[PDB]
Amino acid sequence: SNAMTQLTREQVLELFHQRSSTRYYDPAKKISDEDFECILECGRLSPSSVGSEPWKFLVIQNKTLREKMKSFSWGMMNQLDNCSHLVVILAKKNARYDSPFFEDVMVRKGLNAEQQQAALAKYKALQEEDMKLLESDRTLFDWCSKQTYIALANMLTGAAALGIDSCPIEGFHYDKMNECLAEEGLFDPKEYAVSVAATFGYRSRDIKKSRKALDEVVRWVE
Amino acid sequence: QLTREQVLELFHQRSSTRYYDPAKKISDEDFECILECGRLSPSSVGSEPWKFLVIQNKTLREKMKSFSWGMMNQLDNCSHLVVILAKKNARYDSPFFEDVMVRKGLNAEQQQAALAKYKALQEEDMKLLESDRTLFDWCSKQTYIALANMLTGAAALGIDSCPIEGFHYDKMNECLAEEGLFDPKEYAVSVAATFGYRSRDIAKKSRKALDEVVRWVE
Ligand SMILES: Cc1cc2nc3c(=O)[nH]c(=O)nc-3n(C[C@H](O)[C@H](O)[C@H](O)COP(=O)(O)O)c2cc1C
Ligand SMILES: Cc1cc2nc3c(=O)[nH]c(=O)nc-3n(C[C@H](O)[C@H](O)[C@H](O)COP(=O)(O)O)c2cc1C
Ligand SMILES: O=[N+]([O-])c1ccc(O)cc1
Ligand SMILES: O=[N+]([O-])c1ccc(O)cc1
């Protein structure tokens, strides 16, 4: 890393202040294919526990599907008509250490058989004892869903770095959204479920930050 | 504003560092900038349901080793360690949520309408109220946004990091509560992260191809 591959502290703070939730999009302004691919890359390159990458990104451009969405998506009703791109992020269901899904996770690490068994033993303990994820199907799904929020965050920040506005979205009926997207054939509902969404585009109305102070959220243990 | 190549370089510079140089410390100003990236993160309903515990005490780090397999050696060598807490019991009808509404400036009528909207969000749209753990996990998801932004902001400053789940969560929560750092009825440990400077080159790890993870619905 050097001064040319870094941002200054001033530039980092500007980036994270600029990143904001846009609720009014200009329908006449579309993100270029290349800029949007870059945004998706920010999601794809995100870290994830155990390298599990337990996400799928559905890019919902079809206008008829966006319209149907409106009736059960109160949190983005006024964005569905005018945003450039909409991403619905799915998270993997039943991502147990002993599942076929986890074999592919391991294969792309390029480990030998002994390293693979050492890794698997770590991941079993992580799920079973340390994080207690096998309490229920939902607990294990929510673990994958947490990893998807990393990908979400990175797509919002990457978009902001490109000068592109965005809004993270939880304001929809999850059962209705899962049912609709599965009925459209967009994923196997036994294997994935909706985690979170995000809109992207260019704002048509102005957005300053309101946050708790650093001293109210940070505690130093020296 | 950055070029596409610069944005890509940032996310490629960001890697999970397991081997830290124990002689390299992050400056106070750089670390405050990292914390700002967490503080400035978005969160559902603007709930900001997090606390960032900066664990620099060496005796406390040494105690954690016995139940933190995923960062055992990082604890000896990293510059800074953050344990992020998430709010427990963040119900729409809790005082925690009332404070959110008030500081947004909502009047009495608007607060009543907002309570109804977020009741519906939690009870029906997201079904967060199935159990205490489902509601906690909602706040925990928001903290993963703050985590991600800290890792990326650190990388932008030239500072290495590693997100951490590899510890016994209940033992960590018991320890940190015994230290008096939070009220365990109000918060619980969500995720951690180390920060510092790598002691060797970190081979870039693989990812599934874009075509594997993206589906276009046109
Ligand atoms: C939430 C989360 C928890 C993780 N926990 C650990 C951990 O405890 N110890 C560890 O060495 N790596 C941990 N990792 C790092 C992942 O193994 C790593 O992100 C993945 O292998 C991809 O490598 P990269 O981030 O270098 O691209 C974790 C990652 C995330 C996102
Ligand atoms: C996971 C998540 C879901 C959210 N859901 C919605 C939503 O459905 N609709 C909306 O208008 N804003 C939504 N927001 C945006 C938040 O209200 C916003 O992040 C917060 O008020 C802080 O504002 P800022 O992002 O402009 O800094 C969501 C944020 C997060 C992180
Ligand atoms: O050792 N561990 O508990 C780990 C190691 C890697 C990881 O991504 C998560 C947990
Ligand atoms: O309309 N909604 O459901 C919302 C709106 C804003 C938000 O942060 C979360 C949910």
Residue numbers in the entry:
A (entry chain A): -2 to 204, 206 to 220
B (entry chain B): 3 to 220
Question: What's in the article?
Answer:
Phylogenetically diverse bacteria can carry out chloramphenicol reduction, but only a single enzyme has been described that efficiently catalyzes this reaction, the NfsB nitroreductase from Haemophilus influenzae strain KW20. We found that expression of H. influenzae and Neisseria spp. nfsB genes, but not Pasteurella multocida nfsB, allows Escherichia coli to resist chloramphenicol by nitroreduction. Mass spectrometric analysis confirmed that purified H. influenzae and N. meningitides NfsB enzymes reduce chloramphenicol to amino-chloramphenicol, while kinetics analyses supported the hypothesis that chloramphenicol reduction is a secondary activity. Previous kinetic studies of nitroreductase catalysis revealed that reactions progress by a double-displacement (ping-pong) mechanism that appears to lack the gating steps necessary to impose specificity, explaining the substrate promiscuity of these enzymes.
Hi 12 NfsB showed both the fastest apparent maximum rate and, overall, significantly higher activity (>2-fold more active; q < 0.005) than Hi KW20 NfsB as measured by catalytic efficiency (kcat/Km). We also soaked an analog of chloramphenicol, 4-nitrophenol, into Hi 12 NfsB crystals and solved the resulting enzyme-substrate complex. Similarly, when Hi 12 NfsB contains 4-nitrophenol in its active site, Trp71 swings out, with movement potentially of the whole α3-to-α4 loop, to avoid a clash with the 4-nitrophenol NO2 group. This movement appears to be supported through an interaction with the Met74 side chain, in which the S (Sδ) of Met attracts the Trp71 aromatic ring through a long π-π interaction (7 to 10 Å). For structural changes specific to substrate binding (e.g., nitroaromatics), as opposed to coenzyme binding (e.g., NADPH), we focused on comparisons between the Hi 12 NfsB structure complexed with 4-nitrophenol, the Nm Z2491 structure complexed with nicotinic acid, and the previously published En. cloacae structures complexed with 4-nitrobenzoic acid or NAAD. The phenyl rings of nicotinic acid in the Nm Z2491 NfsB structure and 4-nitrobenzoic acid in the En. cloacae structure coincide with the niacin ring of NAAD in the other En. cloacae structure. The 4-nitrophenol molecule, complexed with Hi 12 NfsB, takes the same position, although rotated approximately 50° around its hydroxy oxygen. We have identified that the NfsB homolog from H. influenzae strain 12 exhibits the highest chloramphenicol reduction activity thus far, likely due to increased flexibility in the small loop between α3 and α4 in the active site.
